[PDB]
Short mmCIF file of C-alpha atoms and ligand atoms in Angstrom, two decimals:
data_model
loop_
_atom_site.label_atom_id
_atom_site.label_comp_id
_atom_site.label_asym_id
_atom_site.label_seq_id
_atom_site.Cartn_x
_atom_site.Cartn_y
_atom_site.Cartn_z
CA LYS A 1 -22.16 12.26 -14.65
CA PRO A 2 -19.48 14.62 -13.25
CA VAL A 3 -18.72 14.42 -9.59
CA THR A 4 -16.93 17.00 -7.45
CA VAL A 5 -13.68 15.90 -5.87
CA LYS A 6 -11.36 17.51 -3.35
CA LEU A 7 -7.77 16.20 -3.52
CA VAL A 8 -4.64 17.08 -1.63
CA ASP A 9 -3.24 18.26 -4.96
CA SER A 10 -5.73 20.85 -6.18
CA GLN A 11 -3.95 20.76 -9.59
CA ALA A 12 -3.89 16.99 -10.02
CA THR A 13 -4.31 15.56 -13.50
CA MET A 14 -7.65 14.60 -14.72
CA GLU A 15 -6.83 10.89 -14.70
CA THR A 16 -5.71 11.28 -11.05
CA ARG A 17 -8.99 12.99 -10.21
CA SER A 18 -10.83 10.23 -12.10
CA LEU A 19 -9.06 7.56 -10.08
CA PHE A 20 -10.27 9.19 -6.87
CA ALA A 21 -13.82 9.43 -8.20
CA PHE A 22 -13.73 5.83 -9.44
CA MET A 23 -12.83 4.52 -5.98
CA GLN A 24 -15.46 6.72 -4.32
CA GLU A 25 -18.12 4.98 -6.34
CA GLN A 26 -16.66 1.47 -6.66
CA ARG A 27 -15.96 1.04 -2.94
CA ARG A 28 -19.63 0.61 -2.08
CA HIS A 29 -20.05 -2.14 -4.70
CA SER A 30 -16.91 -4.29 -4.27
CA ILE A 31 -13.54 -4.56 -2.59
CA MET A 32 -10.66 -4.62 -5.02
CA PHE A 33 -7.82 -7.09 -4.54
CA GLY A 34 -4.31 -5.68 -4.34
CA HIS A 35 -0.93 -7.40 -4.31
CA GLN A 36 2.60 -6.08 -3.75
CA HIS A 37 4.99 -6.92 -6.59
CA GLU A 38 2.01 -8.39 -8.45
CA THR A 39 3.78 -8.80 -11.84
CA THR A 40 7.41 -8.48 -10.73
CA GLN A 41 7.66 -11.30 -8.17
CA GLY A 42 6.06 -14.71 -8.07
CA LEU A 43 6.63 -18.37 -7.27
CA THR A 44 5.09 -19.43 -10.62
CA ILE A 45 5.98 -16.70 -13.06
CA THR A 46 8.64 -17.10 -15.73
CA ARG A 47 8.97 -13.43 -16.76
CA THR A 48 9.15 -10.40 -14.36
CA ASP A 49 8.43 -8.03 -17.20
CA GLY A 50 4.97 -7.15 -15.98
CA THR A 51 2.98 -9.69 -17.99
CA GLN A 52 2.51 -12.48 -15.41
CA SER A 53 1.52 -12.93 -11.80
CA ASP A 54 0.95 -15.68 -9.27
CA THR A 55 -2.55 -14.25 -8.94
CA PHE A 56 -3.20 -14.71 -12.64
CA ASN A 57 -1.84 -18.29 -12.52
CA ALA A 58 -4.12 -19.04 -9.53
CA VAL A 59 -7.40 -17.48 -10.66
CA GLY A 60 -7.14 -16.29 -14.28
CA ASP A 61 -6.98 -12.56 -13.65
CA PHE A 62 -4.53 -10.05 -12.21
CA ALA A 63 -5.01 -8.15 -9.01
CA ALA A 64 -6.84 -4.87 -9.55
CA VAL A 65 -4.43 -2.91 -7.42
CA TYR A 66 -0.68 -3.22 -8.03
CA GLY A 67 1.64 -2.36 -5.14
CA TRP A 68 5.30 -1.38 -5.41
CA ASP A 69 7.69 0.72 -3.34
CA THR A 70 10.30 3.39 -3.39
CA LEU A 71 12.82 0.56 -3.16
CA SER A 72 12.21 0.47 -6.97
CA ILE A 73 12.57 4.28 -7.41
CA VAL A 74 15.16 5.80 -5.09
CA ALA A 75 18.79 4.80 -5.56
CA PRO A 76 20.04 2.20 -5.20
CA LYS A 77 16.71 0.77 -6.36
CA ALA A 78 17.30 -2.57 -4.67
CA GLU A 79 13.92 -3.89 -5.90
CA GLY A 80 14.63 -2.85 -9.49
CA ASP A 81 12.93 -0.44 -11.84
CA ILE A 82 9.16 -0.74 -12.29
CA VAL A 83 8.35 1.84 -14.97
CA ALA A 84 7.66 -0.80 -17.60
CA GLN A 85 5.56 -2.98 -15.32
CA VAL A 86 3.54 -0.03 -14.02
CA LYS A 87 2.91 0.97 -17.61
CA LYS A 88 1.68 -2.55 -18.45
CA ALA A 89 -0.59 -2.52 -15.40
CA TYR A 90 -2.04 0.86 -16.29
CA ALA A 91 -2.58 -0.23 -19.91
CA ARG A 92 -4.74 -3.08 -18.60
CA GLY A 93 -6.73 -0.59 -16.49
CA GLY A 94 -5.10 -1.47 -13.19
CA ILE A 95 -4.57 0.85 -10.22
CA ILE A 96 -1.01 1.59 -8.95
CA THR A 97 0.06 2.19 -5.40
CA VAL A 98 3.60 2.84 -4.10
CA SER A 99 4.77 2.67 -0.51
CA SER A 100 7.89 4.22 0.86
CA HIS A 101 10.60 2.17 2.59
CA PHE A 102 13.04 5.12 2.49
CA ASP A 103 16.56 4.69 3.85
CA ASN A 104 17.38 6.45 7.12
CA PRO A 105 18.57 9.97 6.17
CA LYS A 106 20.69 10.21 9.35
CA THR A 107 22.64 7.00 8.80
CA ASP A 108 22.35 5.93 5.18
CA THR A 109 26.07 6.48 4.48
CA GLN A 110 26.79 3.79 7.14
CA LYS A 111 25.21 0.88 5.26
CA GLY A 112 27.00 -2.47 5.51
CA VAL A 113 25.57 -4.48 8.33
CA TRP A 114 21.77 -4.74 7.81
CA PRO A 115 19.70 -2.95 8.98
CA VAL A 116 22.02 0.05 9.37
CA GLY A 117 20.98 2.96 7.15
CA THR A 118 17.71 1.36 5.94
CA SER A 119 14.07 1.92 6.91
CA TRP A 120 14.66 -0.66 9.65
CA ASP A 121 17.48 1.26 11.21
CA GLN A 122 15.52 2.56 14.23
CA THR A 123 17.84 5.51 14.86
CA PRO A 124 15.43 8.44 15.13
CA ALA A 125 15.73 10.56 12.01
CA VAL A 126 12.57 12.70 11.94
CA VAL A 127 13.83 15.69 13.88
CA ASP A 128 17.14 15.81 11.98
CA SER A 129 15.50 15.42 8.57
CA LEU A 130 13.03 18.32 8.67
CA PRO A 131 14.21 21.74 7.43
CA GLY A 132 16.90 23.05 9.80
CA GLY A 133 18.05 19.50 10.52
CA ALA A 134 21.43 18.28 9.40
CA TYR A 135 20.00 15.50 7.26
CA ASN A 136 17.26 17.46 5.48
CA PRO A 137 19.32 17.40 2.24
CA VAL A 138 19.44 13.60 2.37
CA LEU A 139 15.65 13.24 2.69
CA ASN A 140 15.28 15.83 -0.08
CA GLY A 141 17.41 13.69 -2.41
CA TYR A 142 14.99 10.81 -1.88
CA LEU A 143 12.03 13.02 -2.54
CA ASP A 144 13.71 14.50 -5.64
CA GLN A 145 14.01 11.01 -7.05
CA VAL A 146 10.39 10.15 -6.25
CA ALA A 147 9.32 13.40 -7.99
CA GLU A 148 11.45 12.86 -11.07
CA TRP A 149 10.05 9.34 -11.34
CA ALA A 150 6.45 10.49 -10.98
CA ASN A 151 6.93 13.39 -13.38
CA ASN A 152 8.15 11.11 -16.15
CA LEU A 153 5.71 8.24 -15.47
CA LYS A 154 3.77 8.46 -18.72
CA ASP A 155 1.51 6.24 -20.79
CA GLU A 156 1.95 5.77 -24.56
CA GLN A 157 0.00 8.96 -25.23
CA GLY A 158 2.35 10.96 -23.00
CA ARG A 159 -0.13 11.37 -20.12
CA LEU A 160 0.88 10.93 -16.51
CA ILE A 161 -0.06 7.68 -14.79
CA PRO A 162 -1.80 8.17 -11.42
CA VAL A 163 -0.28 6.58 -8.37
CA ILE A 164 -1.57 6.22 -4.77
CA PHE A 165 1.58 7.22 -2.88
CA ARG A 166 1.63 5.85 0.68
CA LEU A 167 4.08 7.79 2.90
CA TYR A 168 5.79 6.79 6.15
CA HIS A 169 3.60 3.80 6.85
CA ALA A 170 3.20 1.70 9.96
CA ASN A 171 4.11 4.77 11.93
CA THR A 172 2.35 3.81 15.13
CA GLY A 173 5.05 1.19 15.67
CA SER A 174 8.77 1.79 16.23
CA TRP A 175 10.45 -0.51 13.71
CA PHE A 176 10.99 2.30 11.27
CA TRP A 177 12.98 5.55 11.74
CA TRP A 178 9.80 7.65 11.46
CA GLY A 179 7.99 5.62 14.09
CA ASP A 180 6.43 6.40 17.38
CA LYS A 181 9.52 6.12 19.57
CA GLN A 182 11.33 8.20 16.97
CA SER A 183 9.05 11.22 16.84
CA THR A 184 6.42 13.11 18.71
CA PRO A 185 3.04 13.10 16.97
CA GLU A 186 3.63 16.68 15.80
CA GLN A 187 7.07 15.85 14.43
CA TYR A 188 5.57 12.92 12.47
CA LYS A 189 2.83 15.17 11.09
CA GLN A 190 5.43 17.76 10.06
CA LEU A 191 7.50 15.03 8.32
CA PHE A 192 4.43 13.88 6.33
CA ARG A 193 3.24 17.42 5.46
CA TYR A 194 6.74 18.64 4.61
CA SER A 195 7.15 15.67 2.25
CA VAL A 196 3.81 16.09 0.50
CA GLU A 197 4.49 19.80 0.13
CA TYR A 198 7.92 19.14 -1.24
CA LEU A 199 6.60 16.68 -3.86
CA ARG A 200 3.57 18.70 -4.87
CA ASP A 201 4.78 22.30 -4.59
CA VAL A 202 8.54 22.25 -4.82
CA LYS A 203 8.75 19.56 -7.41
CA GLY A 204 5.43 19.83 -9.18
CA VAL A 205 4.11 16.30 -8.86
CA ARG A 206 0.58 16.20 -10.31
CA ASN A 207 -0.21 12.47 -10.53
CA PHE A 208 -0.32 11.42 -6.90
CA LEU A 209 -3.07 10.65 -4.43
CA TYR A 210 -1.63 10.55 -0.87
CA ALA A 211 -2.34 7.73 1.58
CA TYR A 212 -1.81 7.56 5.35
CA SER A 213 -1.55 4.10 6.92
CA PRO A 214 -0.73 3.50 10.60
CA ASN A 215 -0.94 0.01 12.05
CA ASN A 216 -4.21 -1.45 13.35
CA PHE A 217 -5.30 -0.16 16.71
CA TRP A 218 -6.38 -2.57 19.43
CA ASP A 219 -8.26 0.28 21.11
CA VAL A 220 -10.24 1.21 18.01
CA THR A 221 -11.14 4.88 18.37
CA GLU A 222 -11.10 7.93 16.16
CA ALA A 223 -8.97 9.74 18.71
CA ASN A 224 -6.28 7.07 18.50
CA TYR A 225 -6.25 7.19 14.67
CA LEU A 226 -6.08 10.97 14.81
CA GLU A 227 -3.08 11.22 17.09
CA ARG A 228 -0.52 11.00 14.27
CA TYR A 229 -2.96 11.75 11.37
CA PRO A 230 -1.45 14.36 9.07
CA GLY A 231 -4.81 16.03 8.49
CA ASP A 232 -7.52 16.27 5.92
CA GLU A 233 -5.54 18.86 3.93
CA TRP A 234 -2.76 16.32 3.45
CA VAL A 235 -4.35 12.87 2.93
CA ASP A 236 -6.62 11.48 0.19
CA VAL A 237 -6.67 7.86 1.31
CA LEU A 238 -7.20 6.60 4.87
CA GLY A 239 -5.67 3.20 5.34
CA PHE A 240 -4.07 0.94 7.93
CA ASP A 241 -1.71 -2.02 8.00
CA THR A 242 -2.29 -5.27 9.86
CA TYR A 243 -0.51 -8.60 10.24
CA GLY A 244 -1.94 -11.44 12.28
CA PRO A 245 -1.52 -14.89 13.63
CA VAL A 246 -1.89 -17.88 11.37
CA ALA A 247 -3.85 -19.74 14.08
CA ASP A 248 -6.59 -18.93 16.55
CA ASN A 249 -7.15 -15.67 14.72
CA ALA A 250 -10.85 -14.86 15.26
CA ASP A 251 -10.10 -11.95 17.57
CA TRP A 252 -7.56 -10.62 15.04
CA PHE A 253 -10.10 -10.83 12.20
CA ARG A 254 -12.59 -9.00 14.38
CA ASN A 255 -9.96 -6.29 14.90
CA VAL A 256 -9.42 -6.12 11.10
CA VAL A 257 -13.14 -5.47 10.64
CA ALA A 258 -13.21 -2.88 13.44
CA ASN A 259 -10.29 -0.92 12.02
CA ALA A 260 -11.76 -1.08 8.52
CA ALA A 261 -15.07 0.13 9.92
CA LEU A 262 -13.41 3.07 11.65
CA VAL A 263 -11.52 4.20 8.57
CA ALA A 264 -14.66 3.76 6.47
CA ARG A 265 -16.73 5.97 8.74
CA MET A 266 -13.96 8.58 9.00
CA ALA A 267 -13.52 8.54 5.22
CA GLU A 268 -17.19 9.21 4.57
CA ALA A 269 -17.11 12.08 6.99
CA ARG A 270 -13.91 13.57 5.53
CA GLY A 271 -14.31 12.98 1.83
CA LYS A 272 -11.56 10.33 1.72
CA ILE A 273 -11.13 6.82 0.34
CA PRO A 274 -10.83 4.13 3.06
CA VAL A 275 -8.62 1.07 2.38
CA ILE A 276 -6.73 -1.74 4.03
CA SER A 277 -3.31 -0.86 2.67
CA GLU A 278 -1.52 -4.00 3.91
CA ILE A 279 -2.99 -7.18 5.40
CA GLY A 280 -1.63 -10.64 5.89
CA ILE A 281 -0.68 -13.51 8.07
CA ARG A 282 2.46 -12.31 9.88
CA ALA A 283 5.63 -13.14 7.93
CA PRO A 284 7.25 -15.26 10.63
CA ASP A 285 4.32 -17.66 10.66
CA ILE A 286 4.50 -18.12 6.88
CA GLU A 287 8.30 -18.43 7.12
CA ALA A 288 7.75 -21.35 9.59
CA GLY A 289 5.72 -23.23 6.98
CA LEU A 290 2.39 -22.54 8.63
CA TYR A 291 -0.86 -21.87 6.78
CA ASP A 292 -4.52 -20.91 7.36
CA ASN A 293 -6.56 -22.43 4.57
CA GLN A 294 -9.66 -20.43 5.39
CA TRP A 295 -7.86 -17.06 5.68
CA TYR A 296 -9.15 -15.37 2.52
CA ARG A 297 -12.66 -16.69 3.04
CA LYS A 298 -12.65 -15.35 6.60
CA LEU A 299 -11.36 -11.99 5.35
CA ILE A 300 -14.00 -11.41 2.65
CA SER A 301 -16.83 -12.74 4.75
CA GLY A 302 -16.00 -10.65 7.76
CA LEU A 303 -15.43 -7.46 5.80
CA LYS A 304 -18.46 -7.58 3.53
CA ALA A 305 -20.90 -8.48 6.35
CA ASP A 306 -20.01 -5.29 8.21
CA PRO A 307 -21.85 -2.22 6.82
CA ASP A 308 -18.88 0.07 7.39
CA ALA A 309 -15.85 -2.21 6.72
CA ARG A 310 -17.36 -3.34 3.44
CA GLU A 311 -16.98 0.24 2.16
CA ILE A 312 -13.20 -0.04 1.81
CA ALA A 313 -12.04 0.40 -1.77
CA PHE A 314 -9.37 -2.30 -1.64
CA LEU A 315 -7.21 -4.51 0.50
CA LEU A 316 -3.63 -5.41 -0.46
CA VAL A 317 -1.50 -8.41 0.50
CA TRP A 318 2.31 -8.56 0.40
CA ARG A 319 4.86 -9.91 -2.12
CA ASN A 320 5.27 -13.43 -3.36
CA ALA A 321 9.05 -13.85 -3.04
CA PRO A 322 10.16 -16.24 -5.81
CA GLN A 323 12.79 -17.98 -3.65
CA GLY A 324 11.42 -16.92 -0.30
CA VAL A 325 13.83 -15.29 2.17
CA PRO A 326 16.98 -16.42 3.96
CA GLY A 327 16.19 -18.77 6.87
CA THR A 328 18.57 -22.14 3.69
CA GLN A 329 15.48 -20.35 2.28
CA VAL A 330 12.03 -20.14 3.88
CA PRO A 331 8.68 -19.17 2.37
CA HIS A 332 7.62 -15.56 2.19
CA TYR A 333 4.52 -15.03 0.09
CA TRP A 334 0.86 -14.14 0.51
CA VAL A 335 -1.08 -15.10 -2.63
CA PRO A 336 -1.54 -18.93 -2.78
CA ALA A 337 0.31 -20.21 -5.84
CA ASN A 338 -0.99 -22.65 -8.43
CA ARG A 339 1.44 -25.37 -7.39
CA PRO A 340 1.28 -28.67 -5.49
CA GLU A 341 2.10 -27.21 -2.08
CA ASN A 342 -0.90 -24.81 -2.12
CA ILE A 343 -3.18 -27.34 -3.84
CA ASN A 344 -2.45 -29.86 -1.10
CA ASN A 345 -2.73 -27.53 1.91
CA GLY A 346 -6.07 -26.06 0.72
CA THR A 347 -4.82 -22.47 0.39
CA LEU A 348 -5.26 -22.33 -3.40
CA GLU A 349 -8.94 -23.36 -3.00
CA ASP A 350 -9.33 -20.69 -0.32
CA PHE A 351 -7.98 -17.99 -2.64
CA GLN A 352 -10.02 -19.28 -5.57
CA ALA A 353 -13.12 -19.00 -3.41
CA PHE A 354 -12.17 -15.39 -2.51
CA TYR A 355 -11.85 -14.66 -6.25
CA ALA A 356 -15.25 -16.22 -6.96
CA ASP A 357 -16.92 -14.14 -4.23
CA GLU A 358 -19.27 -11.59 -5.82
CA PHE A 359 -17.90 -8.76 -3.73
CA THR A 360 -14.18 -9.05 -4.69
CA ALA A 361 -12.92 -7.18 -7.76
CA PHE A 362 -9.92 -8.20 -9.80
CA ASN A 363 -8.47 -6.27 -12.77
CA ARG A 364 -11.11 -7.21 -15.42
CA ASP A 365 -13.86 -6.27 -12.91
CA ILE A 366 -12.85 -2.61 -12.91
CA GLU A 367 -13.65 -0.43 -15.85
CA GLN A 368 -13.62 3.24 -16.86
CA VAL A 369 -11.29 4.09 -13.96
CA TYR A 370 -9.43 7.01 -15.49
CA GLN A 371 -11.84 8.66 -17.91
CA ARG A 372 -14.53 9.74 -15.43
CA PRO A 373 -15.44 13.44 -15.60
CA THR A 374 -14.83 15.50 -12.48
CA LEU A 375 -15.22 18.92 -10.99
CA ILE A 376 -13.26 20.78 -8.24
O1 LIG B 401 4.35 -6.58 13.27
N1 LIG B 401 5.44 -6.18 12.89
O2 LIG B 401 6.35 -6.01 13.69
C1 LIG B 401 5.64 -5.87 11.57
C2 LIG B 401 4.68 -6.07 10.60
C3 LIG B 401 4.94 -5.76 9.28
C4 LIG B 401 6.18 -5.29 8.88
O3 LIG B 401 6.33 -5.06 7.53
C5 LIG B 401 5.27 -5.17 6.56
O4 LIG B 401 5.07 -6.53 6.29
C6 LIG B 401 5.75 -7.05 5.18
C7 LIG B 401 5.75 -8.59 5.30
O5 LIG B 401 6.34 -8.90 6.58
C8 LIG B 401 7.17 -6.49 5.14
O6 LIG B 401 7.76 -7.23 4.10
C9 LIG B 401 9.08 -6.86 3.82
O7 LIG B 401 9.03 -5.97 2.71
C10 LIG B 401 10.30 -5.44 2.37
C11 LIG B 401 10.13 -4.38 1.28
O8 LIG B 401 9.56 -4.86 0.07
C12 LIG B 401 11.31 -6.51 1.95
O9 LIG B 401 12.58 -5.89 2.07
C13 LIG B 401 13.26 -5.73 0.85
O10 LIG B 401 13.58 -6.96 0.30
C14 LIG B 401 14.42 -6.72 -0.84
C15 LIG B 401 14.83 -8.08 -1.35
O11 LIG B 401 15.18 -8.87 -0.23
C16 LIG B 401 15.64 -5.84 -0.62
O12 LIG B 401 16.24 -5.62 -1.85
C17 LIG B 401 15.27 -4.48 -0.04
O13 LIG B 401 16.41 -3.64 0.20
C18 LIG B 401 14.43 -4.77 1.19
O14 LIG B 401 15.24 -5.29 2.23
C19 LIG B 401 11.29 -7.67 2.95
O15 LIG B 401 12.05 -8.79 2.54
C20 LIG B 401 9.87 -8.07 3.28
O16 LIG B 401 9.21 -8.70 2.20
C21 LIG B 401 7.11 -4.99 4.77
O17 LIG B 401 8.26 -4.34 5.34
C22 LIG B 401 5.79 -4.44 5.29
F1 LIG B 401 5.96 -3.10 5.71
C23 LIG B 401 7.14 -5.12 9.84
N2 LIG B 401 8.39 -4.64 9.52
O18 LIG B 401 9.42 -4.55 10.23
O19 LIG B 401 8.61 -4.30 8.37
C24 LIG B 401 6.87 -5.43 11.18
NA1 NA B 402 -15.87 -1.91 -0.68
ZN1 ZN B 403 -23.16 3.16 -6.26
ZN1 ZN B 404 2.20 -0.39 4.93
#
């Protein structure tokens, strides 16, 4: 049966509209599992061509939601192209989401000593990147590349592949150049709206849903979420990002549930899709060799017991770095791998239990995502 949908892009493709409609329905029946770099990075994969994942090697199915970033789209594409892997994911009925770790438009010519010129260069660059600002052409080059990529992102029948495009995330912190010490709330909203407008109207992107994702609030109120919210005319997906402690984390898990509940209630009221766009044990704790072998079980149990938080469409965990990160090298991964270390520490069992849970949805559990009839 056709359902009526209201997207940021009133001219979005039918598959894009179908994706939205699919999540609207599915979200009250399951929570999909997402994973950054699902088929491009893994501790146990032997090909990064889009056909394998650590998730698959752990549980026998791929994540339903495949996360990537503009680090694979905008020059210099440090994370490498992903067109082929996105296409493989879409062909298996997966859902694609792309975040945006854009370089700093004010300082990107100064790259050399990390983090200068990157997302992590905290030099405020919002004011100088909006129209009238000296660095607006630099930001526009990024957006041009995102648009060209989207506009050519086609399946074997020549139809555009939908993508959930997540702009200027984690913006209630100040580690990025678009953060809260770097912009007034209005300036942040203008940056987000300008960017969406540029992609949709100036460049003609028709295969994006737009997500907004601040960090978790410890004072969980609608007013706090709304402070930097770009507005219902500009967002399709209401998310948030949260990273917690590996130990003594009950209060943190409660906060996860509270934030998920808030976005779920807001989403119902506003005609949006609520999600947890990033969640995980904080990287430093994993990098120190620490583990919580009940983490996934805690996550699913807490979320699905809550009548609001359970209504999220998906949650996504971060990348499984194949050789970790510079420490020597230290671990930096979120999906427990099918390997002796995760067998022995109990994390594999934890994840396998999460997979077995009736309420989680992996790629074979989602069907008919893109062929649902819709009205506007
Ligand atoms: O609480 N905080 O302060 C906080 C929380 C979360 C943050 O970031 C979010 O969490 C994940 C995991 O920590 C973080 O992961 C990084 O992701 C980036 C992008 O994929 C990786 O950086 C890239 O790595 C490749 C290869 O090394 C390079 O080619 C790229 O140029 C780029 O440097 C990085 O290694 C991590 O995996 C994400 O950033 C996510 F938003 C942050 N925070 O500062 O980011 C703080
Ligand atoms: Na759900
Ligand atoms: Zn239903
Ligand atoms: Zn994020």
